[PDB]
Amino acid sequence: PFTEPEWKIPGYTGYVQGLQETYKKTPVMAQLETKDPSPESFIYTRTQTAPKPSPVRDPCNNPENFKKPQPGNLWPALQETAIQASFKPPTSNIALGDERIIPFRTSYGVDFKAPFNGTEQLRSPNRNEDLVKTTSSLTNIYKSSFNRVGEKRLQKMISTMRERMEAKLGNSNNNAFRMRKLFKMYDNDGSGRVHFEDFRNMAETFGMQLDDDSLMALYFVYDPEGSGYLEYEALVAQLMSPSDFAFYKGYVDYSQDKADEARRVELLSQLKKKIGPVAGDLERLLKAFVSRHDLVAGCASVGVVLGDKDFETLAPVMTDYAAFCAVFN
Amino acid sequence: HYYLEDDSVEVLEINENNSGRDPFPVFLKRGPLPKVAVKTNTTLNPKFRKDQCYNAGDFRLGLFINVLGRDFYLHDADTFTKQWYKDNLGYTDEEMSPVDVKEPILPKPRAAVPPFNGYGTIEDSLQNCLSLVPKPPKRDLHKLMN
Amino acid sequence: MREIVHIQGGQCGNQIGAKFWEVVSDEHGIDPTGTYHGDSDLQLERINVYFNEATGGRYVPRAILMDLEPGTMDSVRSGPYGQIFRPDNFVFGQTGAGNNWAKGHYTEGAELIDSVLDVVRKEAESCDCLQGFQVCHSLGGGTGSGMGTLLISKIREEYPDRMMLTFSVVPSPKVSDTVVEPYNATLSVHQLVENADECMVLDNEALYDICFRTLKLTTPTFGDLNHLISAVMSGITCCLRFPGQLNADLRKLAVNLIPFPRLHFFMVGFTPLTSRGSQQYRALTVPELTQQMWDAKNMMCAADPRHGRYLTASALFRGRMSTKEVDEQMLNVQNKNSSYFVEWIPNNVKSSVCDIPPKGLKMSATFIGNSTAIQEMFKRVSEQFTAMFRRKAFLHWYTGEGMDEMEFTEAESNMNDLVSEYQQYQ
Amino acid sequence: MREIVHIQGGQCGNQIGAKFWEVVSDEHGIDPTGTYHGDSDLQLERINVYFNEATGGRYVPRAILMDLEPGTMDSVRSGPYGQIFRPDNFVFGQTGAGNNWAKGHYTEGAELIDSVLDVVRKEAESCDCLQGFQVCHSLGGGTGSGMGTLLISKIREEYPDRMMLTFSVVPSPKVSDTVVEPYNATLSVHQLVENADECMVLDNEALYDICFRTLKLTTPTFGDLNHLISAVMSGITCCLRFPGQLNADLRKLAVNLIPFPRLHFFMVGFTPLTSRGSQQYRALTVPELTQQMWDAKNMMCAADPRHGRYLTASALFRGRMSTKEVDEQMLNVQNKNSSYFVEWIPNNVKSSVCDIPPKGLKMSATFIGNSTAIQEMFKRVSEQFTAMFRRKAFLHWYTGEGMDEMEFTEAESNMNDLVSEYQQYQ
Amino acid sequence: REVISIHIGQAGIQVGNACWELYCLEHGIQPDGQMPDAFNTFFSETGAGKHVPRCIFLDLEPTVVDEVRTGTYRQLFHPEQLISGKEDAANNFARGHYTIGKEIVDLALDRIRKLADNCTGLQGFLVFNAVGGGTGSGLGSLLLERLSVDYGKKSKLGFTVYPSPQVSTAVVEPYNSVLSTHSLLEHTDVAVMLDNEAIYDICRRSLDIERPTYTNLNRLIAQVISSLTASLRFDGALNVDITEFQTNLVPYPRIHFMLSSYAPIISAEKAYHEQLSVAEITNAAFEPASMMVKCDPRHGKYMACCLMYRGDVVPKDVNASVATIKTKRTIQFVDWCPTGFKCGINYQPPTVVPGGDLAKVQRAVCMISNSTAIGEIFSRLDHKFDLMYAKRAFVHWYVGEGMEEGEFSEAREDLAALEKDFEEVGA
């Protein structure tokens, strides 16, 4: 029980630090909330959460505030440009609260947690307990299962599960939420690993209806180890269409930066195509010679045009004639 | 402000335009800093001796100052202060160099230009996504005539 | 599921629409490039109300920006979240009305609202089950007031079975921007009293005084005003977007706040609103919210309710709360100041709770009050409209386009009978 | 449970409060940055009396600052323990009174009181069970005398069923700070005796000889005088915040102190006072603490308590003591100089014992005197009034803003009778 | 011996959500659907290692149901027993009773029928609804109407969330309340009030919760439900099925309005020190400060009482306690019924919900009484309903839905008739 002097009487009118933040909880459980808090409560996030940085609102990042501004020339003759800089519309920055508050803790999710330590496992009705008895040499079970099924049958299985997932999200503006209902939603420890009965369960919630022998075949393919965990990011990419796979992924970068790097990789790949076949004699010529101006003479003599735009694409690669022609090889 | 006349300290708060803070000129009264915790007596406000209090030799441009529990990180100094430190405390030029308390801000994503639909030409098609009101493209008549 | 289509009109509507879509993009965690960046899965299940999926996880809004001048469109695509709008949703003329309600209601509409009707109809039947429409515009400017007003007429004549919210800015005589504020305000309100379902009166006077007193900003721009009304609009749509202990949809709020079909003018307040220098010193508790909410200096209208009476009221609470302290505070504010309420209706206050506060906040409340103090505002506008119409100022720029005098007369009669019926229920 | 509101008006009353909240915030162990750093849990037991946790453990004092000139709003916020007062609680004027009781009570009192009435009333509902009120202000100033006593009258009207503690400085003949002392002193006294429940008068000349002769300070700056006054005020509310053998709250004081509703002008005293030069040559015992109490050189009022009698008094002890030693020490002093106490009352003195001595000591007391030698003060100020009033000097500053001579005539009338009833009982 | 539970409205679903959580916890059912015969009355056994409840949630808004769908008990309620429309009724009996019902009620009816048919020894129906909100009130009355014309002979016990006298969450609550009761009278067999301020103060007073929420109330309600259905669920020295409630508490076809009280309401801090005997818990179940309905039986007169006992109870002591209650004249009985008690005893002591507040107890008593304070309650509701109706407020909503003032007039007079009825029977 809680009999220490630190816990207080229910009929206690003295002050307790942080009792105006508790709710729906008895006094002693409230006193447990303040001292040893659970992650869900505000008393936890006010003490043990790192502060999120909002760097644009910091007055320190603006260096003109440290010194008072000094007057410059405002004579029309003693000038160099006749366009004063246009005032930018000031951004709407009004701080209303600390950014540490992750607000997504629904009431039901807090009131109706799995009310025991072993019930959140959520087993399936049909399951093979012998496989959770950690029997010896799980890899042999994988090999035997895959040799019993045959590889041509998994291709049929993935194809028909593709047809089912294609058939599920018919038309709605919430179809991505149901796609996330496969693995990522009912998931913690965002490392994408799924155990075998959990996989069978998430599959039957959608209607795959996989028997264990076909199930362990998928694992011999997608997990050739004794770990027994599956990387669903590799798997569901085959079931989903590529246009809707992004919805399941949640975040795909469409940045102009990423596009420019995709441009850079395309230019360097084209130039690799260019110097590739003729790379064999360029190294011999360069060793027969290193400066860039000398490299132009070498590259032009051997047969490839090398210009300023070539040097700007090759600037991130080198600076070495040896490693240069090697990465060209 | 460290007043060499009285060895007192005064912390002025600077204000930014449209800050959320009420304007208050001063942040700490002009009294000598304690620098230590002293067992207070309820009758007599403590008499602080110079040895207990801070000295001009304590600020080292990169250190933390325990100002009443607050830990200010001082990061610059005026030209007169730098000169004074070199003159009187034999500091080197490099110590007086200001340390930069600056943190970066990351740009926004600013999504890329879409790849072109294979109907028009690249140049005539880029305008539709570039601007709202489509403008015809421009040519190098400079090179044309020449 | 339950669908809200957004409509923004005029320069003001464009800007507050941009800020509203900014805060909505924030609360659903979508980046300025249109891809999800959030963590909790609570955000994906209710994005259908405001976003339509297109391709590769690109949620675009179900909104219609409407205007007449390209400068507002440049302002839209300049700022952040300006490249998440579909270019087909920028229905936009070329000429510009310029504070003429007649140009706003007869000439440029004849060539604009047809295309607007097309895009909104395509956007209506793109989703299945509407909750209704939400409109944000002005009453003083031309291209927002009249055009949006005719659009309000046309949508009510096609679809009467959907809900309708109108956030309109009304002029105040101290913050008096335009000259013909009466000539366009009366004609707009004369139309929306028969067309609009319910209205939320906004104005810049109370809002400026709120940023001065309660927020202590020295030079607040319009954008901060837009951010406050943006928080207001998110607070009124929070129920359909997030679960809670007691949900209250828009129809629920209308039926609990409108006792008579011509009594549909509310007063809006928002909490909590404290300067960031004063953020650190105060607590965050239910009476601490309630005291700020029921105060007269927190309303977003230039009407002191202590000069009038409340008909009905509503409070929307966001954040994990204690319903007991919610309704006991409502009961206490209803009991202590008992003179400021109507008599023939007990329990004038509707309350609801959703379990998701806005990002960065812990616990908030949005207040909608149907009071009779709004007739003071309409009276203030009526007397000036009479002052002008007594000897026919500025009239010809209206009569020379298709309007006549009986439009003014019927407008004056509607507002006068309205302020008399508000005074009667007081 | 019980909650104290602290009100700091004037220039004098303001600075003392800043020194008060230092010694209080020290005992409960909160540090100048607002974070609790006490060790024992007998300190958090009653932290609500003087503070509220806001969020992040930042305890803010429940006190109102009030003045009319921006000078004090710096010299409070700036000084140590200045970063804890709520920036909302800095309700504040703009002009400044300047020794004119009219301007502080009739001109600015029109537009400032409801502003300071706002936050005070608000803070009243902020706490659960008001214990009472507690004001610190001058009697010779403009804002402390005008805006203080005006608030005093106003708050009694709203809250009649609460106590009232006024820590007031009074003028002195030789150390004349202003020239209109007898005006503003009289005009406040005629205001206090009806609304203020018990007035703990203070002065400076009686503290200078205390700082000079007992504490043997050579440079007794205000930081020292204000520290003594800060000690007594904390000693009054001792039993509300700590356990003890015999508790004495605010009202338990007044019942044993006020035999007639108008004989309620106390003198205060504090022990033990020695210079740090001789701290360790003396003994700290109840036999010794007492002979420092009942000494005449140890009051904080320039009225030799030997020139009258004591109607009643009270002794608030702190620290572990033996009550039998207290009660017989309070007995001998009542019998040996029996000619100084009143004959028609038994048990002239109430003693009470808390269980925690103040930080920096091990045993402390606090003497509170309802003696009749306090009439020698009002005599001095009243008779001065006639000297100026016979010549109507300085009058037109007063009657230049609405006040009339008849009010002055009553100040004579009011003062001269309460110095009569004092004299009737001696 | 099975009972089929139905839950209507935003309240009904939440009450069922807490009620079913308790049921699974008691019978030892993991929230996956199976354990690691007494359950036959609630959990049908399909296939192997599966327990699906004979329950239905129905609602017009999809929010709370989808929440239930994706919460912790996803595998338990299989996705077809939870009916969800596309838009709510929004505090309107009319929109609920005529427009939206005509599309929801048929599917609800055709679903319960095949649930009843799969059941074998069906005992009756148990309905939890909220008449304050449109979704419950209107559609609930519509469902009960179709329920009566279908079966009729089977019992229907109705637990309704009426409005509290002073504290309220809505405005059109009186309209919806009266429009519900006008049909709730003739369709519900035994009605039981579950007001909210009543439980707020109870939780505040007894379990010293400073700032509670609906879930604390829902858990206490579910505790009440389990304690009165325990007789069917388990074996005791003297049990009573649901057919006994109406037999021993309904002396007249239209006098069916019960008041509920529970004991002991004790948190863990007070449990250790309080000696809990059947005497004081039977005493505590009689105070007006311990009732699920905001009323005062002092002003009223009991008509009949029913006492369910759970746990270690020897029938000697319960007999002694009912006798000393009968002899104490602080409460007074009617003369229309001299021997006005029914008793029922079950051995199984209540269970503890981890996340609740009630400590594990040896014994518990649930009292169900009929009185005249209910007639006082209905009139107090009527007064303020007419206060609003006299001015024809909010009625444009209802006539726009399609109804008329006639239903308003008939509900007002029906309440008046019930008023006069309860006054008369009180003598």
Ligand SMILES: Nc1nc2c(ncn2[C@@H]2O[C@H](COP(=O)(O)OP(=O)(O)OP(=O)(O)O)[C@@H](O)[C@H]2O)c(=O)[nH]1
């Ligand atoms: N005790 C208790 N009362 C509840 C609960 N949920 C809702 N209520 C009550 O239900 C009333 C509102 O009715 P709702 O059920 O929310 O709404 P509805 O009946 O579904 O009808 P609509 O809102 O129009 O869809 C409020 O006054 C609450 O007091 C609950 O879980 N426990």
Ligand SMILES: Nc1nc2c(ncn2[C@@H]2O[C@H](COP(=O)(O)OP(=O)(O)O)[C@@H](O)[C@H]2O)c(=O)[nH]1
């Ligand atoms: N709050 C707010 N008000 C605005 C904004 N822009 C314009 N307004 C108000 O709108 C009114 C003028 O609207 P106007 O631009 O003429 O509308 P339009 O001409 O029909 O497009 C003025 O009273 C402004 O105060 C804004 O960004 N925020």
Ligand SMILES: Nc1nc2c(ncn2[C@@H]2O[C@H](COP(=O)(O)OP(=O)(O)O)[C@@H](O)[C@H]2O)c(=O)[nH]1
């Ligand atoms: N003990 C003490 N007295 C003070 C202090 N400051 C001012 N006074 C007294 O206050 C009186 C002047 O008050 P005043 O400034 O006129 O008050 P106000 O102008 O109305 O705000 C003088 O007699 C001083 O003795 C202080 O810090 N300590």
Ligand SMILES: [Mg+2]
């Ligand atoms: Mg509902």
